[PDB]
Amino acid sequence: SMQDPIADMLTRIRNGQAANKAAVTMPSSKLKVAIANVLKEEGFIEDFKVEGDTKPELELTLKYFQGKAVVESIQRVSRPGLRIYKRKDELPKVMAGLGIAVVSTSKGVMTDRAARQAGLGGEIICYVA
Amino acid sequence: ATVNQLVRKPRARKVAKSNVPALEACPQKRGVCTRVYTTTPKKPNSALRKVCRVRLTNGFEVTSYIGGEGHNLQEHSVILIRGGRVKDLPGVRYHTVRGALDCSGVKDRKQARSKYGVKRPKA
RNA sequence: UUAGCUAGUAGGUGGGGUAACGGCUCACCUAGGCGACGAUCCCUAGCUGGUCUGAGAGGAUGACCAGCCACACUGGAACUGAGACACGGUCCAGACUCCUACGGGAGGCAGCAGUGGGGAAUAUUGCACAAUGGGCGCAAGCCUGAUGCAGCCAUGCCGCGUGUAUGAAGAAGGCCUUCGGGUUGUAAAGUACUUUCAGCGGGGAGGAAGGGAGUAAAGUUAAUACCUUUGCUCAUUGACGUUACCCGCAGAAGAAGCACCGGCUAACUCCGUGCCAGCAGCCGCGGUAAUACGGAGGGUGCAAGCGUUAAUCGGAAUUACUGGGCGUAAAGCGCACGCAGGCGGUUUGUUAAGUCAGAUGUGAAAUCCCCGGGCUCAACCUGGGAACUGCAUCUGAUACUGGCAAGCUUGAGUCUCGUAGAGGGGGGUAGAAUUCCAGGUGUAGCGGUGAAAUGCGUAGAGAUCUGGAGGAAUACCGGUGGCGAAGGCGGCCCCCUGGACGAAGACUGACGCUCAGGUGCGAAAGCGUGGGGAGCAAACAGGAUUAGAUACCCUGGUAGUCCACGCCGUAAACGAUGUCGACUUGGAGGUUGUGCCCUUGAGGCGUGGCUUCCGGAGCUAACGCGUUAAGUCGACCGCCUGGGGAGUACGGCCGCAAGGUUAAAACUCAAAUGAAUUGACGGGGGCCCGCACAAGCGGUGGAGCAUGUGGUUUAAUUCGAUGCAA
RNA sequence: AAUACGUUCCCGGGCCUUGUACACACCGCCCGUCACACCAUGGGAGUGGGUUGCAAAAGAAGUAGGUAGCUUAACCUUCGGGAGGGCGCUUACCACUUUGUGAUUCAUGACUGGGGUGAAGUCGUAACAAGGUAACCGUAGGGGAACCUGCGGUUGGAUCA
RNA sequence: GGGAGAAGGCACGCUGAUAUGUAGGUGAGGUCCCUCGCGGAUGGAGCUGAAAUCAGUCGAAGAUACCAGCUGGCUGCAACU
Ligand SMILES: [Mg+2]
Ligand SMILES: [Mg+2]
Ligand SMILES: [Mg+2]
Ligand SMILES: [Mg+2]
Ligand SMILES: [Mg+2]
Ligand SMILES: [Mg+2]
Ligand SMILES: [Mg+2]
Ligand SMILES: [Mg+2]
Ligand SMILES: [Mg+2]
Ligand SMILES: [Mg+2]
Ligand SMILES: [Mg+2]
Ligand SMILES: [Mg+2]
Ligand SMILES: [Mg+2]
Ligand SMILES: [Mg+2]
Ligand SMILES: [Mg+2]
Ligand SMILES: [Mg+2]
Ligand SMILES: [Mg+2]
Ligand SMILES: [Mg+2]
Ligand SMILES: [Mg+2]
Ligand SMILES: [Mg+2]
Ligand SMILES: [Mg+2]
Ligand SMILES: [Mg+2]
Ligand SMILES: [Mg+2]
Ligand SMILES: [Mg+2]
Ligand SMILES: [Mg+2]
Ligand SMILES: [Mg+2]
Ligand SMILES: [Mg+2]
Ligand SMILES: [Mg+2]
Ligand SMILES: [Mg+2]
Ligand SMILES: [Mg+2]
Ligand SMILES: [Mg+2]
Ligand SMILES: [Mg+2]
Ligand SMILES: [Mg+2]
Ligand SMILES: [Mg+2]
Ligand SMILES: [Mg+2]
Ligand SMILES: [Mg+2]
Ligand SMILES: [Mg+2]
Ligand SMILES: [Mg+2]
Ligand SMILES: [Mg+2]
Ligand SMILES: [Mg+2]
Ligand SMILES: [Mg+2]
Ligand SMILES: [Mg+2]
Ligand SMILES: [Mg+2]
Ligand SMILES: [Mg+2]
Ligand SMILES: [Mg+2]
Ligand SMILES: [Mg+2]
Ligand SMILES: [Mg+2]
Ligand SMILES: [Mg+2]
Ligand SMILES: [Mg+2]
C-alpha cells in the first residue's frame, strides 16, 4: 500500500523530471508542502501550489537548465522502515555542500545548512543535488 | 535484505575451516612413524614420492611428506611435522621437518640448506 | 535438531533473623510469578580499562600493566575476629603422599626459586632490604621471594659495531663466451689511516630521603628536665657494582649469515639429470637448449638475523549497518487465508516516550593522539593537553514517529442493476468410434514390419450390412481464445455455489498492506477398502533386431489409467520472475464491459477490465526486460553466500507404505557456473558446384600370364611407401 | 563414337544459417557398474567413560533448638544448696555415600552401507549434434552398469520441408 | 489396546484429640398440608459409621498368623483364546 507518501513525492518529482515533464501533481499534505517550500527556496523547482480544500492536490512546477533537469539526484533517507535522526554536530552535507539535505526539526522543515546554523538536529528526510 | 530481517537474524560470518587440524594450532607436532613408504601423484605428474604415516602426540594419525632427495626414516622413527600440503598428493597436508629429532638433514645440500636441515659446510 | 518453566514457587499477614532492606526463615492466607522482547534446558566462558587489525563502520581478542570478581588439593562446615566462611588457620569426609620402634603420627607450591610429568615451547634451588611500599615497635630496629636488582633465552623493540680512504689494463682463481672478450671487481693484494664495541689498566656521578650523637631556640611545665618541632655542626648508611660516564694501552685487529632470482615478484646463465631424482603459497615445472629439479658463477632482497610453520585482522563490497544479491550464474516457499509482528492515507487539538537543544554530574589511572621535558640518539621514561564519540538527571523545543481524543473521504469495504467465462460440486442426457456378443452376405486370407515372425482365420476370419451390451473420452466450434490463488478446468441440459468486471449514485469511515509460526488447497505416479474395466499400458510372456539387446519395433498383456470414500503432499508445481501500492514516451492486434453519433452500412468519437506481438528511455554480464518492468520508488515476507559431499546422515514431527519435511559435519578439489564470441563438428537446414549422380560407351571383379603388396617360407628372401592421398 | 531431361539419391567441396556440454576441435567430449589402493564418514550385537532427571536410603563435623543423666573457680546463699555454664543425649539442616530406573554426550566395535580421491584396468555408450529412441523433472516398476519402460509436466528441444 | 502389578519407593498396630463417634448411611417424636394414605412436606431425636491429620505409645518385627505375584535382559517357534 501507500505507506510512504514522501518517497512517493520524491519519486514523482524524479520520474517526471527524468520524463522532461513541465509539472507534477500529487495528493497534498503539510509535510509535502513544507518540503516543496525548501525545494523552491533552494531553487530546485520553479514554484508550487495546492488546489482544493477537502481533497487538496499539490502541484510542483519543475525546472530545467541546459535542456537538463535541475534535480540531478533526489533520494529518500529516513523512511517508515528505518527512521534516521541526526544531531546538530552530526548533520550530513550532500556533495560537500553543493547539494542539500532536508531536515525536520522542532522548528519545522529546513536544509542541513539552516538547521546547522540554528543549532538543531532532526529527522533526515532526503538528499537533493 | 530487509532491516527487519537482519534485526531478526543478524549477519553471521562463516567460521574458517582449517587445512591442518592435526596441528591443533601448534607450529609443529611430534609423532611416531607408523608406515614409511612411497606413493604416486595425480594428473599430470608422475613419480615415487616419499611419505610417511605418523601417529602424533595428540592421537591424530596423518600422512606427512618427506621432502628432499634421500632420507633415512623407518617405522618407529620419531619425527617433527609442520603444516604444508603436497598438491599432487591428495590427502597429504603436512611436511616432515628435515633435520629434527630422528629425521636427518638432506645429504650434500648447498642451496636452501635451512629448509632441509643441513649444517653450513666447513669451507 | 531445547517451548514451555516454577511449592519458598509469586505476593500478603505475623513471629523469628541480619550490621542492614528482603521468602532471609517459619506459620497462616491469597494463587500467583517467569516465558517467543527467548523463559526452561543444553554448549561455551571470568568481566572491564584496553590489545591487534581496519580509512572508517566493523572483525578478532582479554599475557605482560591497572580495576572488579572468583578460587587456595576435592566436597562440606563453621570458630576467632572490625573484617574470613581464611593462600602458607581450625573441624569432618574424599583422593593422595611422607614418618614409625607398628601401637600411632604428619602434610597440601595456582607465593619465589627448583623437580617429575605433559608439550613444538617458556629461565636461577642467585643478591639485598640500599631505594619505594607493607606488618609490628615511642624508637632503635626486626620481618618482607612485595619490591629493587642480578643470572638464563636473539623472544621482541631500539641503538651500534663487524672498519675508513686510496688502490687497474682491471692480477691469479672461478664463471660465461660466438675465443675477440665480458664478469666477479676497487672487490682482493698493496698504500696510508681511524680504534666505537669487545679486551686491558686508571679514575669516578646519581638512585640518600633519612637515622645517630651532640648543640641552640620555641611550644611544655614548678622547672634550663623529658617530650616534640625546626635550624647547626661532627661521623655515618648502595644489593645492583668491576654501575652510568670520563681518560689511557694494543692492533683491523675478535665480530656475517639467511632466503630468494618462471609469472604474480626485485634478481639469468652454464653444467648435471631426463615424467626420474625432485620442486610447488597460487598458476604450474621435470621425456635431451629446464632462467621452475640439484650444483655452480652471477644477481636480488633482508641483515644479527633470515627463512619455514602456526595464529588474528586486512585486502574480502567474500554476511554487504556504513556496503551485495535471487528470469537464464548460488538464491521467490507449488498456491492461497491468516494470528503475533513490522509498516500505514489526511485534518485539528493534546501529550512529550522516540527525536532535538542546553545545563550539570560521571565516564579511575595507564594506553592511543598533540606540544613539550629527560637518558649521547632511539627504543624507554616523563609534564600538560586533547580524547574517552558513552551513560544518567534536570530544563526546554514539538517538525517528524509513538500515545490520546474528535474527525475527514481519496485507500478498503457494503448496496443496486447488468455482462462474459472449460471457475467449483451434484444429477441427467447425447452422438461418433473402438472392443465384445448375436445374426445375413461372402471366401481365403487378415494383421504387422524397414523386412519379418509371433498372433488371428475354413469351429468361416478380415471385408460388408443389421441388431444389442459395455466402458472411456468428448471431433467440428477452437483461437499467442476464456476462467481460476496455484494445481489445473472443454459435448449438451438443469440444480447448488465462488470469483472477476462495468455503469450510476448512496452508505460505512483508514475498517488498510504484508505475514515467521498455524491452517487449508495442491498434476501425475503411488497406497487402503469396495466397485468398474472398452481403449491404452509399467510389470511379465512370446516374436524380431543386434557382437550382445534385460531396450528401441511387433503380437499379447497385469497393476494402473475410470467411480466412491480415505491416504500421500511431491514435479522443469515455470514467467525458472513473492505480495501490495505510486510513478515514468509509443505502434499494431486479440478478448470482454460501457457513454455518445443522420443506429440509416458489417461503422464514426470516447472510456474501463484482461491479453498477445514489437519497441523508447532506463536497466542488464550479456541474452534480453521494457506501463502485465527485469525501469523509477516505498511496505512486509521467503531465500542465497565456491564445486563435489547433500537436500545426504543424526535427531524431531508426519505417513499403512513409498516416502515427505526440517537439516548438518568430516573429507576432497581450484575450480564449478552464466551469457556471448571465433572456429570445428552434427546420422540440422537452405542455396550452389565437380564424370558426383543421372544419360551413355568401354571396362575391373571370373580365366591365363606381367607386376606390386600382404602373408607364408628362408641363412637371406635388403631398406622405405599402407584409407581416399601405399 | 554414344549420351546428358535433370540435381531427388551416393561421394568430395563452397557460401549462408542453426544446435553444441567439442577447442590436440567427433579419431572430440563424457556416464555408471565392476577390479585394485588410500581418506573421512553413517549404520551396527555391543564395550568403556563424562554429565544429568526422578524415586527413595544415608547422616561425619558444625551451628541452632530441646534437655531427665553427669559435671562446675568468678555471681547469689539462710553455707544445705541455687542461678548460669560445660559434657553427654536428642531433634532440624546438610557433605560423603547407597539403591532402583530413565535421559543425554564422548570414545570405541566384528561387520556393513553409501561417499570422495587416484597414471594407467574390464564392460558397455547413457548425456552433449535431432547424440542417432529429443532431453530433463516428479513418480512407479524392471534390468550387470550407465539406464529402459509407463503416467503426467517443462522447453532449458533440432527440423518444419 | 497394550507392554504394566513393568521396575522401584513410602505408609500400615495401639491410644487420645479434631469429634466423649467425624464425612456419610438410616430416620422417630413434633408442626403443617392433603385428591386421607402403606401419602407428601417440614423436622432432626435415636441408631449406625469408614477414612484423614496431629499428638502419644509397646515390641526385634503392625499386609505380624492362615492367606498371598519372584523380577529383569537376548533369542527359536506358533499370531492370539
Ligand atoms: Mg516480616
Ligand atoms: Mg573455563
Ligand atoms: Mg605475574
Ligand atoms: Mg609471571
Ligand atoms: Mg590485572
Ligand atoms: Mg573450602
Ligand atoms: Mg563474630
Ligand atoms: Mg574472598
Ligand atoms: Mg602453599
Ligand atoms: Mg617432554
Ligand atoms: Mg680471467
Ligand atoms: Mg670497552
Ligand atoms: Mg649517593
Ligand atoms: Mg622480474
Ligand atoms: Mg625453491
Ligand atoms: Mg639442460
Ligand atoms: Mg596466515
Ligand atoms: Mg568485511
Ligand atoms: Mg553478489
Ligand atoms: Mg525464456
Ligand atoms: Mg538457479
Ligand atoms: Mg512463484
Ligand atoms: Mg501546547
Ligand atoms: Mg631528547
Ligand atoms: Mg604521557
Ligand atoms: Mg595529564
Ligand atoms: Mg582515562
Ligand atoms: Mg500525532
Ligand atoms: Mg457402438
Ligand atoms: Mg460521516
Ligand atoms: Mg486404487
Ligand atoms: Mg507393447
Ligand atoms: Mg496394488
Ligand atoms: Mg521442491
Ligand atoms: Mg520487447
Ligand atoms: Mg535499448
Ligand atoms: Mg561447499
Ligand atoms: Mg531426506
Ligand atoms: Mg546456451
Ligand atoms: Mg553412371
Ligand atoms: Mg583377374
Ligand atoms: Mg553433400
Ligand atoms: Mg560409528
Ligand atoms: Mg548415445
Ligand atoms: Mg538419445
Ligand atoms: Mg514421457
Ligand atoms: Mg504418629
Ligand atoms: Mg537357534
Ligand atoms: Mg499356539
DSSP string computed for B45-70: ----EEEEEEEETTS-EEEEE--SS-
Same domain, A84 and A117: yes
Alpha helices in A1-129 (DSSP H): 5-18, 30-41, 112-117
Residues across chain A: 129
Are both A66 and A86 inside the same structural domain?
Answer: no
CA of A54 to the centre of ligand 30 (A): 14
CA torsion sign for A69, A73, A75, A47 is negative
CA dihedral B28, B33, B38, B41 (to 10 degrees): -30
Identify which of B71, B70, B98, B102 has the alpha carbon closest to the alpha carbon of residue B84: B98
CA of B51 to C1' of C138 (A): 83
Q: What is the dihedral of CA A78, A84, A85, A90, to 10 degrees?
A: -100
A83 and A66 within one domain:
no
| Claim to verify: residue A44 and residue A88 sit in the same structural domain | no
Q: How far apart are CA A16 and CA A45, in angstroms?
A: 12
With cell 531478526, the residue in question is: B8
**Within 13 Å of residue A61, how many CA atoms lie on the same side as its CB?**
7
Contact A29, A8 (CB under 8 A): no
For residues A66 and A77, membership in a common domain is answered with no
Cβ partners under 8 Å of residue B73, min gap 6: B33, B36, B52, B66, B79, B96, B102, B103
Smallest Cα–Cα separation from B81: which of B17, B34, B13? B34
Task: Look at strands A74-76 and A85-86 and give their pairing.
Answer: unpaired
How many domains in chain A? 2
Say yes or no: A3 contacts chain B, CB-CB below 8 A. no
Same domain, A48 and A85: no
Q: CATH number, domain at A17? A: 3.30.1370.30
Residue of A3, A76, A77, A82 to mutate, testing the B interface (most B Cβ within 10 Å of its Cβ): A82
Place of cell 546547522: A116
Which resolution in angstroms does this entry have?
2.1
Assign A6 to helix, strand or coil: helix
β-strand pairing of A122-128 with A100-105: antiparallel
Q: Which domain holds residue B17?
A: 1-123
Element containing residue A11 per DSSP (H, E): helix A5-18
Angle of helix A5-18 versus helix A30-41 axis, rounded to 10: 40
C-alpha B123/C-alpha B108 separation (Å) is 13
The number of residues making up chain B comes to 123
Interatomic CA distance for residues A91 and B85, integer angstroms: 54
* SS3 category, A95: helix
Instruction: Indicate whether A113 and A123 sit together in one domain.
Output: yes
Tell me how far apart the alpha carbons of residues B51 and B62 are, in angstroms, rounded to a whole number: 10
Question: CA–CA distance from A75 to each of A85, A89, A100, A128, B102 (Å)?
Answer: 16, 22, 11, 7, 71
* Nucleotide nearest B45 (Cα, C1'): C275
Domain that holds residue A38: 1-71
CATH code (residue B66):
2.40.50.140
The CA-CA-CA angle for residues B50, B56, B62, to 5°, reads 45
Bridge partners of B79, per DSSP, are B31
Do A88 and A127 belong to one domain?
yes
Query: Would the CA dihedral through A93, A94, A100, A103 be positive or negative?
Result: negative
- How far is B114 from B97, CA to CA, in rounded Å? 10
Residue ending a domain, among A23, A45, A71, is A71
Mark whether A107 and A123 lie in a shared domain: yes
What CATH number corresponds to the domain at position A104? 3.30.1490.10
Experimental method of this PDB entry: X-ray
**Measured distance CA(A90)–CA(A100) in Å, rounded:** 14
Nearest-CA distance from A39 to chain B in Å? 29
Residues A34 and A85 placed together within one structural domain of the fold: no
How far apart (Å, rounded) are the C-alpha atoms in residues B2 and B8? Answer: 10
What does the block give as the cell for B121?
Answer: 659446510
Q: A105 and A115 in contact (C-beta within 8 Å)?
A: yes
In the block, residue with C-alpha cell 482544493: A52
Instruction: Yes or no: say if A104 and A122 are a contact pair by the CB < 8 Å rule.
Output: yes
The C-alpha atoms of residue B98 and residue B52 are separated, in whole angstroms, by 13
Instruction: Tell me the three state secondary structure of residue B114.
Output: helix
Residues 55-114 of A with CB under 8 A from B: 81-82
For B95, the grid coordinates are 611436511
Same domain, A53 and A92: no
Indicate if A17 and A67 belong to the same structural domain.
Answer: yes
Record the cell numbers describing residue A58, joined without a space: 499539490
Report the number of distinct structural domains present in chain B. Answer: 1
Q: Are B79 and B102 in contact (CB under 8 A)?
A: yes
Q: Which grid coordinates are listed for A42?
A: 533552494
- Taking alpha carbons only, the member of B48, B101, B88, B100 closest to residue B70 is B48
Query: In terms of Cα–Cα distance, which of B117, B66, B56, B59 is closest to B89?
Result: B66
Residue type, A62: L
